[PDB]
Design a protein around this ligand. Structure first.
Ligand SMILES: CCCCCCCC/C=C\CCCCCCCC(=O)OC[C@H](COP(=O)(O)OCCN)OC(=O)CCCCCCC/C=C\CCCCCCCC
Ligand SMILES: CCCCCCCC/C=C\CCCCCCCC(=O)OC[C@H](COP(=O)(O)OCCN)OC(=O)CCCCCCC/C=C\CCCCCCCC
Ligand code: HEC
Ligand code: HEM
Ligand code: HEM
Ligand code: HEM
Ligand SMILES: CCCCCCCCO[C@@H]1O[C@H](CO)[C@@H](O)[C@H](O)[C@H]1O
Ligand SMILES: CCCCCCCCO[C@@H]1O[C@H](CO)[C@@H](O)[C@H](O)[C@H]1O
Ligand SMILES: CCCCCCCCO[C@@H]1O[C@H](CO)[C@@H](O)[C@H](O)[C@H]1O
Lengths: 80, 49, 380, 61, 241, 101, 55, 54
């Protein structure tokens, strides 16, 4: 029994309509997308950074590894 | 007092057919439910397959 | 006794109080979908697993080909084999998000739910580890030989404990058998423990993104979440199947298409992706013993999270500092994973140690510290 | 109006909803398979045994 | 680490997620294997019956297996003996044991080719590159007696002498047996030997997506439909203030 | 100077719980003390917080927030519980300390 | 179907080993249900009369 | 144990013959099955005679 002993609530009215009197996915452009963007903006500068900062490290570490595999002509310049 | 209480405007969300406050909503009911149920009945068929 | 049977019946009552009339917060997000997926994920492994077990042979001389003969001769054997194999990754992918979600929303504050959770993870690891040896391929064998030998570093009782586990002097038939046994067993223990997990969980009820009491607005699990979860099931299941069916071995080492051979060490013996992150921390510490402990700690560290919560708030929804720190840590794990996949040479070796250091620093020092600082900035 | 009709004859009575799901499935299978098989084959003209079979199917030795 | 050259990506006719194997090319490949590779390479997991309905007719297959003698037994006296193959037999091993194989190939061991395109990074693209790609060692590099230089093989010194050369065999279908044509067909065949489910697997993937896309959309609408009740829900605080 | 004040106001806005209409104290994690604290709140303040909280949840489930106009302004954020909560803790520490002697 | 062939052979041995490993655990599960229903009423007793007066 | 017509019989034998206390474990398991039934039969009987089935 969890429904009835949850909280002491007073004076809050709510209104809702049957699923059949309303649209499932409404106001896609007027409300939906604008918020998708909103949400996307609020976070990019929190998430993106360390992920981008990861990529770099990956790229560097990768390229450097390959570089150290290449030969340096300065080891054979005086091997007549 | 409760007399001072009114249901907000759901125009922003109502379906096309139940948009006009002066048209019986029952006439378009079978359509509204038949659609949604049609979607569901389909989901079952897919799942079943 | 009572009006409707759903509540009176000693069994329906159970199904009801945890899948139908169960109080769920109204604002839980997609991150909460992982519990059910982990559950489904489990039921699925066991099903495909049994099906594969009904054709497998645990013997060094037949394992490899039993698996092959299954994919080659058993109706849809190939499909079941794939589903089972890839299913394991889908499993971990899910468990890692499940955990993540927990960390970012301070779910761990539900100590017992959390602690059983860590136990589920550990168990799943053992399970997936032994599972991988069963096909007895180059990597199966070799990985088993390197990973299990690790314990030999434990003082005094080291070697003994390993030769015991192996059932001999090296990974051989007596190991393959006891592993198959273990692999068949553990999954069921997972199922059992999952019941405990949800049992503790239900004492408090779910947590929610805003981290504040949701008693003022709870909703019946059904249809809200039964539906939401069934949706999240198909949303993930698509990529799983897409992979399992179009790029089958996208994640597997080709070295495992070669029957185990004790006279040919592969060039780079590494465990499955979902383990790399720790394999990485293992090689960070030069010293067979310290590295093991570091490994152990890499996962056992989860048991401390609850005691390192200093914020006056539960989630990080309203803690931007903690948020970057959180995404840093994630990125950090990504790198560790990457390092684990590469050889032991410069510039990897150093990046490794660096990432391994930042890993423990973030969880042990930064997080609780930034947490306290955040409280002062709120005037708390 | 099909939606209206559909609702009345098919979706209203739980018993008929079920009957629809079954017969609906039976027909959906038959058509989804044939269609997909069709698409897959066109996409692979002349590569499948089904296609080259004739050359050795009563046309050699 | 160490230096290695990675093969390129050839546009195999079966690279497309929805693209199947060109069974004609596979049928040729089987010949290439049968008449060239099978001389040193074992293909333990494939049986003559496997060809039926894929590259050959039940009849051709029955024939192809009778061309071989297998070892059955024992008989009434407990002796072993020979007999003409059946479609139930698996492609004949070239050597009794590995020891014998190494012995006839300079201590080198030609690996069974049943899963080779999945046992090597690059699969066909690699196997194909390797075959055609033999050449002389660059300056400063010396290949020891018995090995052959191949830049595509790790270490570059491979125990396998170039196995295929123009017109080394004649496709009975009337296809110009240029060395590359061969390698190409045989590689195509190796793909198939490695995983016969190839085509069926992909045909399923198609079905899986279509259903998947259909089922997902449906359940999204259903999920939204139920939730709508909450999504639009409006509340207010009305104390007797 | 006003460094400390610049920071706080910044963090306060950085956190963003005010976009939901919540107050600093509305976000407090309900541990043992906060629990006792709340029980002591006068009914009018309790009911209000409850609405606020329930309203925030509804926004969350909707993936929306209040219009900028309605956001709680740093300087108008009322610390309704803080006073109570402090005494609740003062009390505890007394007991904890006393039971030790 | 059950035999996995035309007679009890290897394909049977394996699927039986599987079943034999599995079933026991199903028993354990079910035993929990058994005792769960049991506890609703409590144990019965030799005299067959209400033992509430003396538990 | 090994589940293969060609090794099952001997895997069991090899167990009793080479595995430390294999013979004992094998016995206990085997005889345990009967002890199991003996017990279940009395459990049932008890139930029938005392109308526990109610
Ligand atoms: C471990 C082994 C390492 C393997 C790596 C695992 C796979 C990693 C893939 C990268 C994850 C991509 C996730 C992208 C989601 C980004 C996003 O939406 O961020 C914003 C969003 C905003 O949150 P709120 O503050 O509540 O806003 C409310 C307003 N509506 O943040 C979130 O969704 C919460 C974060 C949950 C996801 C965490 C998943 C990362 C998983 C990695 C494991 C980490 C934990 C430690 C494991 C130890 C073993
Ligand atoms: C060829 C096929 C021939 C074989 C026939 C077998 C199929 C028989 C199916 C019986 C029909 C079901 C009867 C349903 C009646 C109950 C009901 O109310 O509908 C379900 C009800 C809908 O509610 P309402 O829209 O409000 O209904 C109003 C009714 N006036 O609940 C649902 O949402 C269920 C339907 C969605 C299913 C979602 C499943 C998604 C899963 C996908 C993964 C793939 C499957 C793999 C299975 C794994 C097995 C190892
Ligand atoms: C004379 C015997 C012989 C013939 C004929 C031959 N091979 Fe080989 N093949 C070998 C040997 C020897 C090796 C082992 C090389 C080593 O490991 O050093 C080998 C190895 C291979 C490998 C790669 C091994 C690796 O480690 O990458 C492939 C693939 C291969 N052969 C393909 C073929 C194909 C296809 C054919 C027929 C066109 C063929 N071989 C014909 C003897 C042969
Ligand atoms: C066999 C693996 C597991 C299964 C099947 C499982 C299942 C679940 C389920 C069904 C839920 C409820 C829905 C949800 O919030 O996702 C849940 C919640 C939770 N699980 Fe797990 N879990 C598993 C592993 C773990 C692990 C590894 C941890 C963490 C170390 C964990 C921690 C939690 C916690 C804290 C909750 C509370 C969620 C909240 O914040 O409301 N679980 N788990
Ligand atoms: C907890 C869920 C499970 C996980 C995470 C898991 C994981 C694995 C893994 C990773 C492998 C190696 C797959 C490969 O690459 O070949 C595997 C193989 C196998 N598993 Fe599981 N498994 C699980 C449960 C089961 C269960 C319950 C059974 C049946 C009782 C089972 C039976 C087998 C068998 C027979 C194989 C060998 C055949 C093969 O390799 O495909 N698995 N499992
Ligand atoms: C895996 C096998 C079983 C286990 C482990 C099991 C266990 C138990 C346990 C622990 C009890 C309580 C103590 C007792 O009265 O013995 C019990 C009671 C009972 N069991 Fe079982 N049981 C099993 C099989 C069965 C079977 C086959 C039947 C009958 C068809 C049965 C009928 C009952 C009933 C009716 C009771 C009530 C006892 C009373 O009259 O008070 N059990 N069982
Ligand atoms: C190639 O295609 C496959 O051929 C098989 C027959 O060999 C069928 O059973 C599969 O359904 C079909 O997809
Ligand atoms: C998300 C649910 C995905 C299920 C998709 C079902 C597709 C599997 O369908 C399979 O297609 C093959 C190709 O013709 C047939 O040979 C198999 O008999 C058939 O079962
Ligand atoms: O019967 C008993 O009922 C209890 C109450 O549900 C359970 O906790 C026990 O596990 C079960 O054995």
């Amino acid at each position: 029994i969890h429904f009835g002993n949850l909280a002491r609530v007073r004076h809050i009215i709510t209104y809702s309509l049957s699923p059949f009197e309303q649209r499932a996915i409404p106001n896609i452009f007027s409300d939906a997308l604008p918020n998708v963007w909103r949400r996307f903006s609020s976070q990019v500068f929190k998430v993106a950074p360390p992920f981008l900062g990861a990529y770099l490290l990956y790229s560097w570490g990768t390229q450097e590894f390959e570089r150290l595999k290449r030969k340096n002509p300065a080891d054979y310049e005086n091997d007549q | 007092v409760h007399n001072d209480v009114t249901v907000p405007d759901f125009s922003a969300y109502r379906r096309e057919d139940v948009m006009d406050a002066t048209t019986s909503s029952q006439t378009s009911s079978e359509d509204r439910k038949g659609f949604s149920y049609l979607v569901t009945a389909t989901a079952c068929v897919a799942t079943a397959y | 006794m009572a009006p409707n049977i759903r509540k009176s019946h000693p069994l329906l009552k159970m199904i009801n109080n945890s899948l139908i009339d169960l109080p769920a917060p109204s604002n839980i997000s997609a991150w909460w979908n992982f519990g059910s997926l982990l559950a489904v994920c489990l039921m699925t492994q066991i099903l495909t697993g049994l099906l594969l077990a009904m054709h497998y042979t645990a013997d060094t001389s037949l394992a490899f080909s039993s698996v092959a003969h299954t994919c080659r001769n058993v109706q849809y054997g190939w499909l079941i084999r794939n589903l089972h194999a890839n299913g394991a990754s889908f499993f971990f992918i899910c468990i890692f998000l499940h955990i993540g979600r927990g960390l970012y929303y301070g779910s761990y504050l539900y100590k017992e739910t959390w602690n059983t959770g860590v136990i589920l993870l550990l168990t799943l690891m053992a399970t997936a580890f032994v599972g991988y040896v069963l096909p007895w391929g180059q990597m199966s064998f070799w990985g088993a030989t390197v990973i299990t030998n690790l314990f030999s570093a434990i003082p005094y009782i080291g070697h003994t404990l390993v030769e015991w586990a192996w059932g001999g002097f090296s990974v051989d038939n007596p190991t393959l058998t006891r592993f198959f046994a273990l692999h068949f067993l553990l999954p069921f223990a997972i199922a059992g423990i999952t019941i405990i997990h949800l049992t503790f969980l239900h004492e408090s009820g779910s947590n929610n993104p805003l981290g504040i009491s949701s008693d003022s607005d709870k909703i019946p699990f059904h249809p809200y979440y039964s539906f939401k979860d069934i949706l999240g099931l198909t949303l993930m299941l698509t990529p799983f199947l897409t992979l399992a069916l179009f790029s089958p071995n996208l994640l597997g080492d080709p070295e495992n298409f070669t029957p185990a051979n004790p006279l040919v060490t592969p060039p780079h013996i590494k465990p499955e992706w979902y383990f790399l992150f720790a394999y990485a921390i293992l090689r960070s510490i030069p010293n067979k013993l310290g590295g093991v402990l570091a490994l152990a700690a890499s996962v056992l560290i989860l048991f401390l999270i609850p005691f390192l919560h200093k914020s006056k708030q539960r989630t990080m929804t309203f803690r931007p500092l903690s948020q970057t720190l959180f995404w840093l840590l994630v990125a950090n794990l990504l790198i560790l994973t990457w390092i684990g996949s590469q050889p032991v040479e410069h510039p990897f070796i150093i990046i490794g140690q660096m990432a391994s250091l930042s890993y423990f620093t973030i969880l042990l020092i930064l997080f609780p510290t930034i947490g306290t600082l955040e409280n002062k900035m709120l005037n708390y | 109006a099909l939606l209206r009709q559909a609702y009345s004859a098919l979706f209203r009575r739980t018993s008929t909803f079920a009957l629809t799901v079954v017969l609906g499935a039976v027909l959906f299978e038959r058509a989804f398979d044939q269609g997909a098989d069709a698409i897959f084959e066109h996409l692979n003209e002349g590569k499948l045994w089904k296609h080259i079979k004739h050359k050795y199917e009563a046309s050699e030795e | 680490g160490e230096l290695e050259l990675h093969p390129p990506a050839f546009p195999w006719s079966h690279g497309g997620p929805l693209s199947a194997l060109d069974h004609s090319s596979v049928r040729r490949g089987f010949q290439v294997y049968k008449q060239v590779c099978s001389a040193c390479h074992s293909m333990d997991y494939v049986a003559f019956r496997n060809l039926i309905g894929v590259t050959h007719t039940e009849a051709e297959a029955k024939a192809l297996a009778e061309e071989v003698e297998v070892q059955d037994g024992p008989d009434e006296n407990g002796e072993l003996f020979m007999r003409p193959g059946k479609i139930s037999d698996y492609f004949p091993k070239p050597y009794p044991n590995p020891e014998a194989a190494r012995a006839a190939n300079n201590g080198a061991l030609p690996p069974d080719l049943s899963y080779i395109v999945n046992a090597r990074h690059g699969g066909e693209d690699y196997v194909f590159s390797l075959l055609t790609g033999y050449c002389d060692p660059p300056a400063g590099v010396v290949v020891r007696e018995g090995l052959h230089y191949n830049p595509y093989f790790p270490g570059q010194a491979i125990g396998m002498a170039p196995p295929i050369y123009n017109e080394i065999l004649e496709y009975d279908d009337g296809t110009p047996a240029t060395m590359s044509q061969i390698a190409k067909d045989v590689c195509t065949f190796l793909r198939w030997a490695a995983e016969p489910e190839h085509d069926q697997r992909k045909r399923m993937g198609l079905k899986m997506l279509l259903i998947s896309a259909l089922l997902t959309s449906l359940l999204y609408y259903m999920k939204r439909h139920k939730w709508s009740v909450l999504k639009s829900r409006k509340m207010a605080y009305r104390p007797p203030k | 100077g006003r460094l400390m004040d610049r920071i706080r106001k910044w963090y306060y806005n950085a956190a963003g719980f005010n976009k939901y209409g919540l107050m600093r104290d509305d976000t407090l994690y309900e541990d043992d003390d906060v629990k006792e604290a709340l029980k002591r709140l006068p009914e009018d303040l309790y009911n209000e917080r409850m609405f606020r909280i329930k309203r925030a949840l509804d926004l969350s489930l909707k993936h929306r927030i209040l219009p900028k106009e309605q956001w709680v302004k740093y300087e108008e954020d009322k610390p309704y519980l803080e006073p109570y909560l402090k005494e609740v803790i003062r009390e505890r520490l007394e007991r904890e300390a006393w039971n030790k002697k």
